[PDB]
Amino acid sequence: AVGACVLCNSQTSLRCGACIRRPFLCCKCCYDHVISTSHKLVLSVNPYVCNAPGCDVTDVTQLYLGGMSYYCKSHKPPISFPLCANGQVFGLYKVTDFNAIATCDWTNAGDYILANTCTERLKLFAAETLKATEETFKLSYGIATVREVLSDRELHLSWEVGKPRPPLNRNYVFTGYQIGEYTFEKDAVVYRGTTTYKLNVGDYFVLTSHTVMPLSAPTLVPQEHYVRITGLYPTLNISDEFSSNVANYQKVGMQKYSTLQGPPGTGKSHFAIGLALYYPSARIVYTACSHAAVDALCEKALKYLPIDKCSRIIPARARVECFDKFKVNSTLEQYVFCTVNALPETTADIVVFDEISMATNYDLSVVNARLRAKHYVYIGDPAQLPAPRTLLTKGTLEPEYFNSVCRLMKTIGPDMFLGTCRRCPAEIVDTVSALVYDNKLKAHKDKSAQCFKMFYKGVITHDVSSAINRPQIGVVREFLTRNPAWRKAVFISPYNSQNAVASKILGLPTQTVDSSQGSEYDYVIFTQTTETAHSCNVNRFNVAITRAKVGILCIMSDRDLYDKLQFTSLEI
Ligand SMILES: [Zn+2]
Ligand SMILES: [Zn+2]
Ligand SMILES: [Zn+2]
């Protein structure tokens, strides 16, 4: 019942009973909170409530201290002081931003803007409060029950009435009843179970709302600049392959934390693995939010680092199939590859946190709490996709508000910038360089002359709110008959329902823009599907077109983005 104030760190016996995270508030801050919000319950050793029998006064502003006890205006003794007086709430040991975080419902972009522009302690309060709200929102969804099992990949579901149905894609992960985690995609629904289990009738699925633990560490440790490389020992025999990053690797050792902005195909994994070769005796923990990003770092390490000095940390509750070529769960290996949520409590010479646009401040804080490091390297790209904000429905979240690292990269600039895209045909590099990189991204490849664009709005239908554009898929099918080399293409769209329709009509492998991030293919076929804020988002557009190594076909709905594509236009 005694701790440090979230706002001014002052010692207090007071916590807000109305905040969902019950934060410590000092006398001055507790007062400014209760006096400006609907939050009137204050908790000390005991709640500040009227102690008189049967009384219901709990509002701190209507309460008084009568001896060692609390009473309202109606039950107070003649000798009593108000609990709220002279800008303070009475307590042992004797804000506009805090109030907005404490009372917002997290449905507006302004809520996330504030959560990233506030003090460091309020960033943790906002992250914990937000994450708690997001988990309690998972309880709002209805239970799915097996009505009938059709096959090994298809079944029929009966939903709970009165409660809304969660969107059906790979982002929404259910728990069966615990018969393993399950995902669903569109009466016959397609199911995918983590554990191969014979689906029984009457079995039910719920999105597993986990308990949000409190945060302790900052999103970023205080910056420290050094005169020399600190705690790290450079090689004098650095391979030519990594020579381009030697100045950047030295910058890494000369400051507590460093940020690396790496546009698509500019060498992010190459940089991360090269850091190990440049400081060969340094113990590095490689982390990312997703198993996929951690696996991509494992792939690069498998090529350049000694396999016996690596370990892939996999939590006992395996939620996906991941990297198999390293010794599993050997926390003490020189190179540890592990998702943020599975990080052990350990130390490191360098912590490399990859795909930083996908991290939340909650993730930034967890990394700082589990890992004590000499150096922290944040690698990613604020021009790429952020983590989905399931509660956010009003407004667009700009890259400078994705998290603390993205905020720094967009305001003061990244510490390091990989400026040459080695993946994409020049038409793609030139389009995205002008679009999101202020013309600082350069092409290594020539123009492929295999980048096409077609302006075709088609017809937009909807599987609930997920969009489908059958005429856009029809245009693709027509193009494929005339361009058989594109048979090997990956179909990409901003919607899973569009991808499900394209998978049946085209037979191409399918991928959403959000699930394509970090991946690359020779040929990409993209159908914009709609003109929505979602399908027109420049970071999503950036990711979509930068998946291509050789060619891309963009079937566009939006005039602006279509005109910005430096591609050959097709007719029909
Ligand atoms: Zn409160
Ligand atoms: Zn305070
Ligand atoms: Zn009373």
Coordinates of C-alpha atoms and ligand atoms in Angstrom, one line a residue:
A1 CA 0.0 0.0 0.0
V2 CA 3.1 2.3 0.0
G3 CA 5.1 3.2 -3.2
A4 CA 6.4 5.9 -5.5
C5 CA 4.1 8.3 -7.4
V6 CA 3.7 7.6 -11.1
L7 CA 3.9 11.3 -11.9
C8 CA 6.5 12.9 -9.6
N9 CA 8.1 9.8 -8.0
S10 CA 7.2 11.3 -4.5
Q11 CA 6.6 8.7 -1.7
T12 CA 2.9 7.9 -1.0
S13 CA 0.4 5.9 0.8
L14 CA -2.2 6.7 -2.0
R15 CA -3.3 4.7 -5.0
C16 CA -6.3 5.5 -7.4
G17 CA -9.0 3.0 -6.8
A18 CA -10.7 4.2 -10.0
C19 CA -7.6 3.6 -12.4
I20 CA -7.7 0.0 -13.9
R21 CA -4.0 -0.3 -13.0
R22 CA -4.4 1.3 -9.4
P23 CA -1.3 3.6 -9.7
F24 CA 0.5 5.3 -6.9
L25 CA -0.3 9.0 -6.7
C26 CA 1.4 11.4 -4.2
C27 CA -0.8 13.9 -2.2
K28 CA -0.4 16.8 -4.8
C29 CA -0.9 14.5 -7.8
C30 CA -3.7 12.4 -6.2
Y31 CA -5.6 15.6 -5.7
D32 CA -5.1 17.0 -9.2
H33 CA -6.3 13.6 -10.5
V34 CA -9.5 13.3 -8.4
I35 CA -10.4 17.0 -8.7
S36 CA -10.2 16.9 -12.5
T37 CA -11.7 13.4 -13.4
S38 CA -14.6 11.1 -12.5
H39 CA -12.0 9.1 -10.4
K40 CA -12.9 9.7 -6.8
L41 CA -12.0 6.5 -5.0
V42 CA -8.7 6.8 -3.2
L43 CA -7.0 3.7 -1.7
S44 CA -4.5 3.9 1.2
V45 CA -3.9 1.0 3.8
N46 CA -7.7 0.9 3.8
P47 CA -10.0 2.6 1.2
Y48 CA -10.9 6.3 1.8
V49 CA -14.6 5.6 2.4
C50 CA -17.1 6.7 5.0
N51 CA -16.5 4.4 8.0
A52 CA -20.0 5.1 9.5
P53 CA -22.3 2.1 9.4
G54 CA -24.2 1.6 6.1
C55 CA -22.8 4.7 4.5
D56 CA -22.0 4.7 0.8
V57 CA -19.8 7.9 0.5
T58 CA -16.6 6.8 -1.3
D59 CA -15.9 10.2 -3.1
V60 CA -12.6 11.5 -1.6
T61 CA -13.7 15.1 -2.0
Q62 CA -16.8 14.5 0.2
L63 CA -14.7 12.8 3.0
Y64 CA -13.0 13.9 6.2
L65 CA -10.5 12.5 8.7
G66 CA -12.1 12.2 12.2
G67 CA -9.3 10.9 14.4
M68 CA -7.7 8.0 12.6
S69 CA -10.9 7.3 10.6
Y70 CA -12.8 8.7 7.5
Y71 CA -16.4 10.1 7.4
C72 CA -18.5 12.1 4.9
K73 CA -20.0 15.6 5.6
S74 CA -23.1 13.9 7.2
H75 CA -21.2 11.5 9.6
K76 CA -18.2 13.6 10.5
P77 CA -17.3 14.6 14.1
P78 CA -16.8 18.4 14.9
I79 CA -13.0 17.8 14.9
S80 CA -12.4 16.8 11.3
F81 CA -10.2 17.9 8.4
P82 CA -11.3 17.4 4.8
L83 CA -9.3 14.7 2.9
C84 CA -9.1 17.0 -0.1
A85 CA -7.6 20.4 0.9
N86 CA -4.9 22.9 -0.1
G87 CA -4.2 21.1 -3.4
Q88 CA -3.6 17.8 -1.7
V89 CA -5.3 14.5 -0.8
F90 CA -4.4 13.6 2.9
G91 CA -1.9 10.7 3.1
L92 CA 1.4 9.7 4.6
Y93 CA 4.6 11.3 3.4
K94 CA 3.3 15.0 2.7
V95 CA -1.1 15.9 -14.5
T96 CA -3.4 16.9 -17.4
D97 CA -1.5 14.2 -19.4
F98 CA -1.9 11.5 -16.6
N99 CA -5.7 12.2 -16.4
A100 CA -6.2 11.7 -20.1
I101 CA -4.3 8.3 -20.1
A102 CA -6.1 7.2 -16.9
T103 CA -9.6 7.9 -18.4
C104 CA -9.4 7.3 -22.2
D105 CA -10.9 4.2 -23.8
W106 CA -8.0 3.8 -26.3
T107 CA -10.3 4.0 -29.4
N108 CA -8.7 7.3 -30.6
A109 CA -5.3 7.9 -32.2
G110 CA -4.8 10.9 -29.9
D111 CA -4.7 8.4 -27.0
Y112 CA -1.7 6.7 -28.6
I113 CA -0.1 10.1 -29.4
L114 CA -0.3 11.1 -25.8
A115 CA 1.0 7.6 -24.7
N116 CA 4.2 8.4 -26.7
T117 CA 4.7 12.1 -26.1
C118 CA 4.4 12.0 -22.3
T119 CA 7.1 11.5 -19.6
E120 CA 8.8 8.1 -19.4
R121 CA 6.9 7.0 -16.3
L122 CA 3.6 7.9 -18.0
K123 CA 4.6 5.9 -21.1
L124 CA 4.7 2.8 -18.8
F125 CA 1.4 3.7 -17.1
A126 CA -0.2 4.2 -20.6
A127 CA 1.3 0.9 -21.9
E128 CA 0.1 -1.2 -19.0
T129 CA -3.4 0.6 -19.0
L130 CA -3.7 0.2 -22.8
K131 CA -2.6 -3.5 -22.7
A132 CA -5.0 -4.2 -19.8
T133 CA -7.9 -2.5 -21.8
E134 CA -7.0 -4.6 -24.9
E135 CA -7.1 -7.8 -22.8
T136 CA -10.5 -7.0 -21.1
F137 CA -11.8 -6.2 -24.7
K138 CA -11.0 -9.9 -25.7
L139 CA -13.7 -10.9 -23.0
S140 CA -16.3 -8.9 -25.0
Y141 CA -16.2 -11.4 -27.9
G142 CA -18.6 -14.4 -28.1
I143 CA -17.7 -18.0 -27.6
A144 CA -17.5 -20.2 -30.8
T145 CA -18.9 -23.8 -30.4
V146 CA -18.5 -26.7 -32.8
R147 CA -22.0 -27.4 -34.2
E148 CA -20.5 -30.1 -36.7
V149 CA -17.0 -31.3 -37.9
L150 CA -17.0 -31.5 -41.7
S151 CA -13.4 -32.5 -42.3
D152 CA -9.6 -32.2 -41.0
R153 CA -9.5 -28.5 -42.2
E154 CA -13.2 -27.4 -42.3
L155 CA -16.1 -27.3 -39.7
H156 CA -19.3 -25.4 -38.7
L157 CA -19.4 -23.0 -35.8
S158 CA -22.3 -21.8 -33.5
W159 CA -21.7 -18.4 -32.0
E160 CA -22.7 -16.8 -28.7
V161 CA -25.7 -14.5 -29.2
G162 CA -25.6 -11.0 -27.7
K163 CA -21.8 -10.8 -28.0
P164 CA -20.0 -9.8 -31.1
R165 CA -17.9 -12.2 -33.2
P166 CA -14.1 -11.6 -33.5
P167 CA -12.7 -11.1 -37.0
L168 CA -11.6 -14.4 -38.5
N169 CA -8.0 -14.4 -39.7
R170 CA -4.6 -15.5 -38.4
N171 CA -4.3 -12.4 -36.0
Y172 CA -7.2 -13.7 -33.9
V173 CA -5.8 -16.8 -32.1
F174 CA -8.3 -19.0 -30.1
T175 CA -7.8 -21.6 -27.4
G176 CA -10.0 -24.8 -27.7
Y177 CA -11.6 -26.6 -24.8
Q178 CA -7.0 -26.7 -23.5
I179 CA -6.9 -28.7 -26.8
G180 CA -4.3 -26.4 -28.3
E181 CA -4.5 -23.0 -29.9
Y182 CA -6.6 -22.6 -33.1
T183 CA -7.2 -20.0 -35.9
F184 CA -10.2 -19.7 -38.4
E185 CA -10.8 -18.3 -41.9
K186 CA -14.1 -18.2 -44.0
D187 CA -21.2 -21.3 -43.7
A188 CA -18.1 -23.6 -43.8
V189 CA -15.2 -22.2 -41.9
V190 CA -11.6 -23.3 -42.4
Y191 CA -9.8 -24.3 -39.1
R192 CA -6.1 -24.6 -38.2
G193 CA -5.0 -26.2 -34.9
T194 CA -1.5 -25.8 -33.4
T195 CA -1.9 -29.4 -32.0
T196 CA -3.4 -31.9 -34.5
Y197 CA -6.5 -32.9 -32.6
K198 CA -9.6 -34.8 -33.8
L199 CA -12.2 -31.9 -33.5
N200 CA -15.1 -33.0 -31.2
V201 CA -18.7 -31.6 -31.4
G202 CA -19.5 -29.2 -28.5
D203 CA -15.8 -28.2 -28.2
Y204 CA -15.5 -24.4 -27.8
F205 CA -13.0 -21.6 -28.7
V206 CA -12.2 -18.5 -26.8
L207 CA -9.5 -15.8 -27.4
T208 CA -7.0 -16.3 -24.5
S209 CA -7.0 -13.0 -22.5
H210 CA -3.6 -13.1 -20.6
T211 CA -3.0 -11.2 -17.4
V212 CA -1.1 -8.0 -18.1
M213 CA 1.9 -7.8 -15.8
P214 CA 3.1 -4.4 -14.4
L215 CA 6.0 -2.6 -16.1
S216 CA 9.1 -1.5 -14.2
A217 CA 11.9 -0.6 -16.7
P218 CA 11.7 2.4 -19.1
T219 CA 10.9 1.9 -22.8
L220 CA 14.5 3.2 -23.4
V221 CA 17.3 3.4 -20.8
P222 CA 18.8 6.9 -20.4
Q223 CA 21.2 7.5 -23.3
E224 CA 24.9 7.5 -22.6
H225 CA 27.5 8.6 -25.1
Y226 CA 31.1 7.3 -24.7
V227 CA 34.5 8.6 -25.8
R228 CA 35.7 5.0 -26.8
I229 CA 34.0 1.6 -27.6
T230 CA 32.8 0.4 -24.2
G231 CA 32.7 -3.2 -23.0
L232 CA 33.2 -4.5 -26.5
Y233 CA 36.4 -5.7 -28.3
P234 CA 36.6 -5.1 -32.1
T235 CA 38.2 -7.5 -34.6
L236 CA 41.0 -6.2 -36.7
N237 CA 40.3 -9.1 -39.2
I238 CA 36.7 -8.0 -40.2
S239 CA 35.4 -9.7 -43.4
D240 CA 34.9 -7.5 -46.6
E241 CA 31.2 -8.6 -46.6
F242 CA 30.7 -6.5 -43.4
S243 CA 33.2 -3.7 -44.0
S244 CA 30.4 -1.4 -45.0
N245 CA 29.1 -1.5 -41.4
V246 CA 32.4 -1.0 -39.5
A247 CA 31.7 2.8 -38.8
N248 CA 28.1 1.8 -37.6
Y249 CA 29.4 -1.1 -35.4
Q250 CA 31.8 1.4 -33.8
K251 CA 28.9 3.9 -33.2
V252 CA 27.1 0.9 -31.5
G253 CA 29.9 0.4 -29.0
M254 CA 30.2 4.2 -28.3
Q255 CA 26.7 4.8 -27.0
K256 CA 24.3 3.0 -24.6
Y257 CA 21.6 2.5 -27.3
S258 CA 21.5 3.1 -31.0
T259 CA 18.8 3.1 -33.7
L260 CA 19.1 1.7 -37.2
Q261 CA 16.6 2.6 -39.9
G262 CA 16.8 0.0 -42.6
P263 CA 14.4 0.3 -45.5
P264 CA 13.4 -3.0 -47.3
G265 CA 16.3 -5.1 -48.5
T266 CA 19.0 -2.7 -47.2
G267 CA 20.8 -5.2 -45.1
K268 CA 19.1 -5.2 -41.6
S269 CA 19.8 -8.9 -40.8
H270 CA 23.3 -8.6 -42.4
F271 CA 24.0 -5.7 -40.1
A272 CA 22.7 -7.5 -37.0
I273 CA 24.7 -10.7 -37.6
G274 CA 27.8 -8.7 -38.7
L275 CA 27.8 -7.0 -35.3
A276 CA 28.6 -10.5 -33.8
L277 CA 31.5 -10.8 -36.2
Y278 CA 32.8 -7.3 -35.4
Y279 CA 32.7 -7.9 -31.6
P280 CA 33.5 -11.6 -31.7
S281 CA 33.6 -12.2 -27.9
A282 CA 30.4 -10.2 -27.2
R283 CA 27.4 -12.2 -25.9
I284 CA 24.4 -11.0 -28.0
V285 CA 20.7 -11.5 -27.4
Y286 CA 18.7 -11.2 -30.6
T287 CA 15.1 -10.4 -30.0
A288 CA 12.0 -9.4 -31.9
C289 CA 8.2 -9.6 -31.2
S290 CA 7.4 -12.4 -33.6
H291 CA 8.7 -15.9 -34.0
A292 CA 9.1 -15.1 -37.8
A293 CA 11.5 -12.1 -37.2
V294 CA 13.5 -14.1 -34.6
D295 CA 13.7 -17.1 -37.2
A296 CA 14.9 -14.7 -39.9
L297 CA 17.8 -13.6 -37.6
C298 CA 18.5 -17.4 -36.9
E299 CA 18.7 -18.0 -40.7
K300 CA 21.4 -15.2 -41.1
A301 CA 23.3 -16.4 -38.0
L302 CA 23.2 -20.0 -39.4
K303 CA 25.2 -18.8 -42.4
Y304 CA 27.8 -16.6 -40.6
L305 CA 28.0 -17.6 -36.9
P306 CA 29.2 -20.8 -35.2
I307 CA 26.1 -22.9 -34.8
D308 CA 27.3 -24.4 -31.4
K309 CA 27.4 -20.8 -29.9
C310 CA 23.7 -20.3 -30.8
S311 CA 20.5 -21.1 -29.1
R312 CA 16.8 -20.6 -30.1
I313 CA 14.7 -20.0 -26.9
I314 CA 11.2 -21.6 -27.3
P315 CA 8.6 -21.3 -24.6
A316 CA 7.2 -24.7 -23.5
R317 CA 3.7 -23.7 -24.8
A318 CA 4.7 -23.9 -28.5
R319 CA 2.2 -21.6 -30.4
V320 CA 3.9 -22.0 -33.9
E321 CA 6.6 -24.1 -35.6
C322 CA 9.9 -22.2 -35.4
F323 CA 13.8 -22.5 -36.0
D324 CA 15.1 -26.0 -35.4
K325 CA 18.9 -25.8 -36.3
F326 CA 20.2 -24.4 -33.0
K327 CA 20.3 -26.0 -29.5
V328 CA 16.9 -25.2 -27.9
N329 CA 16.6 -23.3 -24.6
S330 CA 20.3 -22.9 -23.7
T331 CA 20.1 -19.4 -22.2
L332 CA 23.8 -19.3 -21.7
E333 CA 24.9 -19.7 -25.3
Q334 CA 26.9 -16.7 -26.7
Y335 CA 24.0 -16.0 -29.2
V336 CA 20.5 -16.2 -28.0
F337 CA 17.5 -15.9 -30.3
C338 CA 14.2 -15.3 -28.6
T339 CA 10.9 -13.5 -28.9
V340 CA 10.2 -10.6 -26.5
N341 CA 7.4 -12.4 -24.5
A342 CA 9.8 -15.5 -24.0
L343 CA 13.0 -13.6 -22.9
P344 CA 14.8 -15.0 -19.9
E345 CA 16.1 -12.7 -17.2
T346 CA 19.7 -12.4 -18.3
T347 CA 22.6 -10.1 -19.1
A348 CA 24.3 -9.4 -22.5
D349 CA 27.1 -7.3 -24.1
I350 CA 24.6 -6.3 -26.9
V351 CA 20.9 -6.8 -27.2
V352 CA 19.6 -6.5 -30.8
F353 CA 15.9 -5.8 -31.0
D354 CA 14.8 -6.2 -34.6
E355 CA 11.5 -5.3 -36.5
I356 CA 11.1 -2.3 -34.2
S357 CA 8.1 -0.7 -36.0
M358 CA 6.1 -3.9 -34.7
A359 CA 7.0 -3.3 -31.1
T360 CA 4.8 -1.5 -28.6
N361 CA 6.2 0.5 -25.6
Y362 CA 5.0 -2.5 -23.5
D363 CA 7.6 -4.7 -25.5
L364 CA 10.3 -2.0 -25.2
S365 CA 9.8 -2.0 -21.4
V366 CA 9.8 -5.8 -21.1
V367 CA 13.1 -6.0 -23.0
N368 CA 14.7 -3.4 -20.6
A369 CA 13.4 -5.4 -17.6
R370 CA 14.5 -8.9 -18.6
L371 CA 17.8 -7.9 -20.3
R372 CA 20.7 -6.0 -18.6
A373 CA 23.0 -4.9 -21.4
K374 CA 26.0 -2.8 -22.2
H375 CA 24.5 -1.9 -25.6
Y376 CA 21.0 -1.9 -27.1
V377 CA 20.5 -1.8 -30.8
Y378 CA 17.1 -1.1 -32.2
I379 CA 16.7 -2.2 -35.8
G380 CA 13.6 -1.6 -38.0
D381 CA 11.9 0.9 -40.2
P382 CA 9.2 3.5 -39.1
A383 CA 8.1 3.5 -42.8
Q384 CA 6.9 -0.2 -42.3
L385 CA 3.9 -1.6 -40.5
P386 CA 3.3 -1.2 -36.8
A387 CA 1.7 -3.7 -34.4
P388 CA -2.1 -3.8 -34.9
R389 CA -4.0 -1.7 -32.3
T390 CA -7.1 -3.7 -31.9
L391 CA -8.9 -0.9 -29.9
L392 CA -7.9 1.9 -32.3
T393 CA -10.9 2.8 -34.6
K394 CA -10.7 6.6 -34.8
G395 CA -7.8 8.4 -36.5
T396 CA -4.6 7.2 -38.0
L397 CA -1.5 6.4 -36.0
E398 CA 1.5 8.1 -37.5
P399 CA 5.0 6.4 -37.4
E400 CA 6.4 8.9 -34.8
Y401 CA 3.8 7.4 -32.3
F402 CA 4.4 3.6 -33.0
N403 CA 6.7 3.4 -29.9
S404 CA 9.6 5.4 -28.3
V405 CA 12.2 4.1 -30.8
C406 CA 10.1 5.1 -33.8
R407 CA 9.4 8.4 -32.2
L408 CA 13.2 9.1 -32.0
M409 CA 13.8 7.9 -35.6
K410 CA 11.1 10.3 -36.9
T411 CA 11.9 13.3 -34.7
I412 CA 15.8 13.4 -34.3
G413 CA 16.5 10.8 -37.0
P414 CA 17.9 7.3 -36.7
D415 CA 21.5 6.9 -35.5
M416 CA 22.3 4.8 -38.6
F417 CA 20.5 4.5 -41.9
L418 CA 21.1 1.7 -44.5
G419 CA 20.6 3.7 -47.7
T420 CA 20.8 1.1 -50.5
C421 CA 18.0 -1.2 -51.4
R422 CA 19.6 -4.3 -52.9
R423 CA 16.3 -6.2 -53.3
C424 CA 14.0 -4.3 -55.5
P425 CA 13.9 -3.3 -59.2
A426 CA 14.7 0.4 -59.4
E427 CA 11.1 1.3 -60.3
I428 CA 10.0 0.1 -56.8
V429 CA 13.0 1.7 -55.0
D430 CA 12.4 5.1 -56.7
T431 CA 8.6 5.0 -55.9
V432 CA 9.1 4.2 -52.1
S433 CA 12.2 6.5 -51.8
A434 CA 10.0 9.5 -52.8
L435 CA 6.9 8.2 -50.9
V436 CA 8.3 7.5 -47.4
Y437 CA 12.1 8.0 -47.4
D438 CA 12.5 11.7 -48.4
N439 CA 14.5 10.5 -51.5
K440 CA 17.3 9.0 -49.4
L441 CA 16.7 5.4 -50.5
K442 CA 18.9 4.4 -53.5
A443 CA 18.5 1.5 -55.9
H444 CA 21.2 -1.0 -56.4
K445 CA 19.4 -3.0 -59.1
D446 CA 18.5 -1.6 -62.5
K447 CA 14.9 -1.1 -63.5
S448 CA 13.5 -4.6 -64.2
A449 CA 10.9 -3.3 -66.8
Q450 CA 8.6 -6.0 -65.1
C451 CA 6.8 -3.5 -62.8
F452 CA 3.2 -2.8 -64.0
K453 CA 0.3 -0.8 -62.8
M454 CA -3.4 -0.8 -63.7
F455 CA -6.0 1.6 -62.5
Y456 CA -9.1 -0.5 -62.0
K457 CA -11.6 0.2 -59.2
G458 CA -13.6 -3.0 -59.9
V459 CA -16.5 -3.9 -57.6
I460 CA -16.1 -4.0 -53.8
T461 CA -18.0 -6.6 -51.9
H462 CA -17.5 -7.5 -48.2
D463 CA -17.1 -10.6 -46.0
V464 CA -18.3 -8.7 -42.9
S465 CA -15.8 -5.7 -43.1
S466 CA -13.0 -7.6 -44.9
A467 CA -13.1 -6.5 -48.5
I468 CA -13.2 -8.5 -51.8
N469 CA -12.7 -7.2 -55.3
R470 CA -13.6 -10.0 -57.8
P471 CA -13.2 -7.8 -60.9
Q472 CA -9.6 -7.0 -59.7
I473 CA -8.9 -10.8 -59.4
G474 CA -10.4 -11.2 -62.9
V475 CA -8.0 -8.6 -64.3
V476 CA -5.1 -10.6 -62.6
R477 CA -6.3 -13.9 -64.1
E478 CA -6.4 -12.3 -67.6
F479 CA -2.9 -10.9 -67.1
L480 CA -1.6 -14.4 -66.0
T481 CA -2.8 -16.0 -69.3
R482 CA -0.7 -13.4 -71.2
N483 CA 2.3 -13.5 -68.8
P484 CA 2.9 -17.1 -67.9
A485 CA 6.2 -16.3 -66.1
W486 CA 4.0 -14.7 -63.4
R487 CA 2.6 -18.2 -62.6
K488 CA 5.3 -18.2 -59.8
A489 CA 3.9 -14.9 -58.3
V490 CA 2.7 -14.3 -54.7
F491 CA -0.7 -12.7 -54.5
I492 CA -0.8 -9.8 -52.0
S493 CA -3.7 -7.6 -50.9
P494 CA -4.6 -5.6 -47.7
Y495 CA -7.5 -8.1 -47.0
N496 CA -7.7 -11.8 -46.0
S497 CA -11.1 -12.2 -47.7
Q498 CA -9.7 -10.9 -51.0
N499 CA -6.7 -13.3 -50.6
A500 CA -9.2 -16.3 -50.0
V501 CA -11.0 -15.4 -53.2
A502 CA -7.7 -15.0 -55.1
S503 CA -6.4 -18.4 -53.7
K504 CA -9.4 -20.2 -55.2
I505 CA -9.5 -18.4 -58.6
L506 CA -5.8 -17.9 -59.3
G507 CA -4.2 -20.7 -57.2
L508 CA -1.3 -18.3 -56.4
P509 CA 0.2 -18.4 -52.8
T510 CA -1.5 -15.6 -50.9
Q511 CA -0.3 -13.2 -48.3
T512 CA -1.7 -10.0 -46.6
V513 CA 0.5 -6.9 -46.7
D514 CA 0.9 -7.3 -42.8
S515 CA 1.9 -11.0 -43.1
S516 CA 4.3 -10.3 -46.1
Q517 CA 6.5 -7.9 -44.0
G518 CA 10.0 -9.2 -43.7
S519 CA 9.5 -11.5 -46.8
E520 CA 10.6 -11.3 -50.4
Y521 CA 9.5 -12.9 -53.6
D522 CA 10.6 -12.7 -57.3
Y523 CA 7.1 -11.7 -58.4
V524 CA 4.3 -10.0 -56.6
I525 CA 0.7 -9.4 -57.7
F526 CA -1.0 -6.7 -55.6
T527 CA -4.7 -5.8 -55.7
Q528 CA -5.5 -2.7 -53.7
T529 CA -9.1 -4.1 -53.3
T530 CA -10.6 -0.8 -52.0
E531 CA -10.0 2.9 -51.4
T532 CA -10.0 2.9 -47.6
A533 CA -7.5 4.5 -45.1
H534 CA -6.3 0.9 -44.5
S535 CA -5.6 0.1 -48.2
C536 CA -4.2 3.6 -48.9
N537 CA -1.8 3.7 -45.8
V538 CA 1.6 4.7 -47.2
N539 CA 3.5 2.3 -44.8
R540 CA 1.3 -0.6 -45.9
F541 CA 1.8 0.4 -49.5
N542 CA 5.5 0.7 -49.0
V543 CA 5.7 -2.9 -47.5
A544 CA 3.4 -4.3 -50.2
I545 CA 5.5 -3.1 -53.3
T546 CA 8.9 -3.7 -51.6
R547 CA 8.3 -7.5 -51.3
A548 CA 9.3 -7.9 -55.1
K549 CA 12.8 -8.8 -56.2
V550 CA 12.0 -8.9 -60.0
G551 CA 8.5 -7.8 -60.9
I552 CA 5.3 -6.5 -59.5
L553 CA 1.8 -6.0 -60.9
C554 CA -0.3 -3.4 -59.0
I555 CA -4.0 -3.3 -59.6
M556 CA -4.9 0.0 -58.0
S557 CA -8.1 1.6 -56.7
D558 CA -6.5 4.9 -55.4
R559 CA -5.6 7.5 -58.0
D560 CA -2.9 9.2 -55.8
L561 CA -1.0 5.9 -55.1
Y562 CA -1.4 4.7 -58.7
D563 CA 0.0 8.0 -60.1
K564 CA 3.0 7.7 -57.6
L565 CA 3.9 4.2 -58.9
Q566 CA 6.9 4.7 -61.3
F567 CA 5.7 1.6 -63.2
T568 CA 4.6 0.9 -66.8
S569 CA 0.9 1.4 -67.0
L570 CA -1.3 -1.4 -68.6
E571 CA -4.6 -0.8 -70.4
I572 CA -8.1 -2.5 -70.0
Ligands
ZN1 ZN -7.7 7.2 -11.5
ZN2 ZN 3.1 13.0 -7.4
ZN3 ZN -21.1 8.8 5.9

